[PDB]
Design a protein around this nucleic acid. Structure first.
Lengths: 316, 316
RNA sequence: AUUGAAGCAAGCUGUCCCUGAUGGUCGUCAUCUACCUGCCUGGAGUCAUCCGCGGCAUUUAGCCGC
């Protein structure tokens, strides 16, 4: 039994989860540099709040799927390709899943020499001397960064076609709260007010102000475009792998990534699918039993590179 | 039902679709280096802005009819004429359908050898002086590529009358949002700010500002000039074919490709027509069944050039 | 403004990738209190039978219960 037939019958998959604070009724939204909380008027006039941006939700899905301690995937995903950056002493400096872009890092394919630079040059030569073959780029990613296929890349540098090639994200997710109402609560640093004077030297007492919010409903949205994976069309077992990976990554994030900030503890009540309608979501304990087989299948199909893990040493 | 027998006197067919983001509330527009701020005064006294320009709408309406990977029409469209340019290795790289410039290009009709140049010259030596008739020009364009009829083309070369011959657009479109209220957001380069504060290398932190926009209603307008089509009068069945192609293009753009930019998916809630009202637009599942009969009929009339696939030399 | 196309500046280039969060005790004392007249004179009144004409009758063809 496979879900890919039922999903490849449909042009898009949409999921929605409803969340509430675990304790109390307040939460802290992301603080944008010059705006702090980010909110505005909805279509019906009601006040809306952007709880967390998608660009960080991506980092959270990556952080749940990968372990920076063992420098390896979790037991199920163990086998997928990943580039690692070493330092001059041979200690792991970073890895793609830890990185932001995962490919265009100034630590990967940078410095005095990197094999990945010539690998990408030779692979993408078809795009440097002809039309932009999306499928060949996609499998190009498959070879090195299976996660960069889900979250995309932008290779802006001159040597790589001047950045004229790109792969937009196939998965987008964000979390939002509607009809919000603010709650202000400041404070003071308070000890030894008279002994300690100049506040600029850390002395004295100084006040601060903080704003929390409350909402009747909080929703997390997941938007996976089944049109893009079939536009890559690289392999139906590869599509099986990509969908199972996305489902696993979300189903597990919704349990282990629950509290986004120290003052933003949330709990999931239910998960629902918006498209396909009437479709069933598999259990996480079953995704974890199946996914190793899909990875073994795609390795037997030889779509991954050899060796799967590629190590490059960085120096400025 | 037969379209032109019902329309039969209206000079223009004006249609409207009302559409919204699939999830959430926000969308983003294009960015102009030359025009700058894309918000302007409105006669209704409220903010309006173009969500998409006609120039881009045309570039997208031709995409929904073609497969970039198989390099072929969709199974209803398979049979229409398409112009391909070979590469020096013998695998064509581009076609007139997927490029807006079509005839007047640096890859067709310009080069060091030019055959389609002579194939146009042969009938330019028939048109010669005086007001060139739109009939024969349209027949020539339907011999090379009907897309250059439905979306227009002209030739700038001095040897080709220096732009004196020019076929105007038949289909027009744009998208607009009304009562737009602005919003704002941002982000930063998170990881590894410590090793160097410099921005030129991209290691250090940088604050990036962006602005999303919200509106109670967003709408697409399209207008088809039926008086010009019937002024072509190439046989009633050919007119029925051209009308069916324009409607299939719209019905495709409104079911797939609505996400002009990957940050925001849209779907349409309704489609409507304003000027010739009462009549209802056909459904997709019947237009898909009807079209192939029309294609076979017009092929049996043999109005377009008989070598349905044309290859031409390309050199640089 | 019209017979012999202003319905006529018409084809003209801006795209995707980015995590802003770790922790700050607004807290202690304070008396609101005392005196004062609401009240006062004033007509709502007056006469008008619960019987039943229902049912039987489309009914003046004709009567009959509680």
């Amino acid at each position: 039994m496979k879900l890919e037939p039922l999903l490849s019958d449909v042009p898009r998959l949409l999921m929605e989860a409803d969340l509430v604070p675990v304790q109390g009724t307040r939460f802290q939204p992301t603080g944008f540099p010059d705006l702090g909380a980010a909110h505005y008027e909805g279509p019906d006039g009601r006040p809306m709040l952007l709880v967390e941006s998608a660009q960080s939700m991506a980092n959270r899905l990556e952080t749940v799927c990968w372990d920076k301690d063992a420098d390896d995937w979790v037991v199920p995903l163990r086998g997928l390709p990943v580039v690692k950056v070493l330092d001059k002493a041979g200690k792991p400096l970073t890895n793609s899943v830890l990185e932001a872009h995962r490919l265009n890092s100034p630590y990967i394919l940078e410095g005095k020499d990197k094999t990945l630079f010539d690998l990408l040059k030779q692979e993408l030569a078809h795009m440097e001397e002809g039309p932009v073959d999306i499928r060949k780029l996609a499998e190009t990613l498959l070879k090195v960064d299976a996660n960069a296929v889900l979250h995309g890349v932008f290779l802006a540098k001159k040597e790589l076609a001047g950045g004229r090639l790109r792969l937009p994200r196939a998965l987008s997710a964000f979390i939002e709260a509607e009809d919000v109402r603010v709650a202000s609560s400041g404070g003071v640093k308070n000890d030894h007010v008279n002994p300690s004077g100049d506040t600029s030297r850390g002395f004295g007492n100084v006040p601060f102000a903080r704003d929390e919010y409350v909402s009747p409903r909080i929703k997390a949205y997941f938007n996976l475009d089944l049109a893009q994976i079939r536009a890559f069309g690289l392999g139906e077992q590869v599509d099986r792998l990509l969908i199972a990976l996305a489902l696993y990554k979300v189903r597990r994030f919704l349990v282990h990534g629950l509290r986004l900030r120290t003052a933003c503890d949330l709990d999931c009540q239910a998960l629902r699918v918006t498209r396909p309608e009437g479709w069933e979501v598999p259990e996480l304990s079953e995704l974890e039993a199946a996914l190793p087989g899909l990875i073994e299948a795609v390795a037997g199909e030889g779509r991954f590179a050899q060796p799967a893990v590629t190590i490059v040493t960085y120096e400025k």
